[PDB]
């Protein structure tokens, strides 16, 4: 409960509450121009209620050739659980993973320093996270090397030719798609997971039969554990450890790996 952690938001969770398409907070939006420095604009989703305190934030990058619309459903789904969610566009649709990581950080720096005051008054600027799809997921890994003070990283069906992530010390949850032919889990997602420190709080979830664009379509299996990961590590909320440890056994999951307990 709140006596043990000033960052806990929302009622005590259940499997139903993390599977729900909306959490307990209502959500408002705010668009950001592509002339924002260091990235290509995007959309900020944020909780409306301020009665429980300020919130952490996650920047969300799209993949190669893609734009923020490929990631829009995370906005209200995750922000309603008590997060500021920033779906961003890249400088160009052909930007590479390192560039996407710089742009995730530029977008977080926008929230902390330049965002509308309705957003800033609800933001804990010290509790920030990254998430992204395909090359944006490669950028998620990149961003945590660039900024080790981030609190969580969620690479979704990630793409990156750089396979070695032993320097990463931000808790990282990689989601792979079993049938991914664009970023095969055997050469992208799983080598990334295996190269993260064995001492790091980390997880890998492989979605049975799923393809590369599974993260661009509302997916309860993705959503429930993205929410649980962000709760546990951006809010330090150990009420969500119950869903992450022991490993999820959802029928939709082909394989799950972790450094549980955490
Ligand atoms: Ca710009
Ligand atoms: Zn508590
Ligand atoms: Zn309330
Ligand atoms: Zn909406
Ligand atoms: Zn790179
Ligand atoms: Zn590297
Ligand atoms: Zn597999
Ligand atoms: Zn399968």
């Amino acid at each position: 409960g709140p006596q043990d952690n000033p960052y806990e938001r929302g009622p005590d969770p259940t499997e139903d509450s993390i599977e729900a398409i909306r959490g307990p907070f209502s959500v408002a939006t705010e668009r950001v121009s592509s002339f924002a420095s260091g990235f290509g604009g995007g959309t900020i989703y944020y909780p409306r209620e301020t009665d429980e305190g300020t919130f952490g934030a996650v920047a969300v990058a799209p993949g190669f050739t893609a734009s923020q619309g490929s990631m829009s459903w995370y906005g209200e789904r995750v922000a309603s659980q008590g997060f500021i969610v920033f779906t961003i566009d890249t400088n160009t649709r052909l930007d590479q993973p390192g560039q996407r990581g710089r742009q995730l950080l530029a977008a977080l720096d926008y929230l902390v320093e330049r965002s509308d005051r309705k957003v800033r008054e609800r933001l804990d600027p010290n509790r920030l996270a990254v998430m992204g799809h395909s090359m944006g997921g490669g950028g998620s890994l990149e961003a945590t090397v660039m900024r080790p003070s981030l609190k969580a990283s969620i690479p979704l069906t990630p793409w990156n030719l750089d396979k070695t992530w032993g320097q990463v010390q931000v808790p990282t949850f990689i989601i792979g798609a079993e049938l991914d032919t664009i970023a095969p889990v055997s050469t992208h997602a799983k080598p990334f997971y295996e190269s993260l420190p064995s001492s790091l709080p980390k997880a890998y979830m492989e979605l049975d039969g799923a393809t590369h664009f599974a993260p661009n379509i509302p997916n309860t299996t993705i959503a429930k554990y993205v929410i649980s990961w962000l709760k546990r590590f951006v809010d330090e909320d150990t009420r969500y450890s119950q869903f992450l440890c022991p490993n999820p056994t959802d029928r939709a999951i082909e394989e799950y790996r972790s450094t549980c307990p955490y």
Side-chain angles (χ1 to χ4, degrees), residues 8-262:
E8 279 171 29
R9 307 282 177 266
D12 294 348
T14 62
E15 191 141 42
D16 286 352
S17 79
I18 65 174
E19 291 189 336
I21 68 172
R22 293 291 152 93
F25 297 94
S26 53
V27 172
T29 48
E30 175 84 24
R31 296 183 56 247
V32 179
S33 164
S34 56
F35 297 138
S37 173
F39 65 115
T43 308
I44 302 161
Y45 304 80
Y46 61 89
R48 284 163 60 91
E49 297 75 11
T50 63
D51 56 314
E52 300 181 21
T54 54
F55 301 93
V58 56
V60 184
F64 199 66
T65 69
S67 76
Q68 66 167 313
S70 77
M71 308 297 287
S72 59
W73 76 272
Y74 293 94
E76 276 156 325
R77 189 116 176 205
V78 176
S80 67
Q81 300 271 351
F83 299 97
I84 294 171
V85 182
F86 198 177
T87 58
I88 75 165
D89 285 318
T90 50
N91 283 335
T92 93
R93 284 180 184 260
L94 305 186
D95 289 356
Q96 296 290 135
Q99 297 172 302
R100 292 174 191 266
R102 282 298 167 204
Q103 299 178 43
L104 280 161
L105 296 185
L108 292 171
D109 290 344
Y110 175 88
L111 289 178
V112 171
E113 302 168 359
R114 301 170 191 256
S115 72
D116 192 302
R117 96 185 202 173
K118 293 185 304 296
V119 177
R120 219 173 306 186
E121 294 202 30
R122 290 163 165 83
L123 171 68
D124 190 333
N126 294 126
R127 299 193 295 112
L128 309 179
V130 288
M131 180 163 66
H133 175 232
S134 198
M135 280 197 189
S140 193
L141 291 166
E142 302 274 349
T144 62
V145 179
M146 291 164 176
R147 186 165 306 175
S149 63
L150 293 170
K151 298 201 70 69
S153 173
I154 305 181
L156 305 161
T157 58
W159 193 96
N160 205 318
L161 302 181
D162 171 3
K163 314 293 181 183
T164 55
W165 298 95
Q167 334 90 294
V168 173
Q169 291 167 332
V170 177
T172 297
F173 178 32
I174 292 164
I175 294 173
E178 185 178 28
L179 195 44
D180 193 331
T181 60
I182 294 171
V185 297
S186 63
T187 56
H188 291 259
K190 286 187 272 222
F192 306 152
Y193 177 79
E194 296 175 9
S195 70
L196 298 164
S198 57
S199 63
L200 183 64
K202 57 177 185 175
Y204 170 66
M205 176 176 73
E206 184 174 310
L207 296 170
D208 190 338
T211 60
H212 193 62
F213 303 96
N216 310 124
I217 302 166
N219 181 310
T220 299
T221 307
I222 292 176
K224 68 193 289 188
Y225 296 123
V226 163
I227 290 159
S228 296
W229 197 260
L230 291 174
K231 283 285 179 174
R232 171 68 183 80
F233 294 102
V234 177
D235 301 353
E236 311 245 3
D237 189 343
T238 55
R239 296 180 302 169
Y240 289 79
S241 296
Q242 64 178 295
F243 313 108
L244 301 169
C245 302
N247 291 353
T249 56
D250 302 46
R251 173 191 202 100
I253 297 165
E254 187 94 29
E255 160 178 6
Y256 200 102
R257 308 279 177 262
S258 77
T259 58
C260 284
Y262 39 71

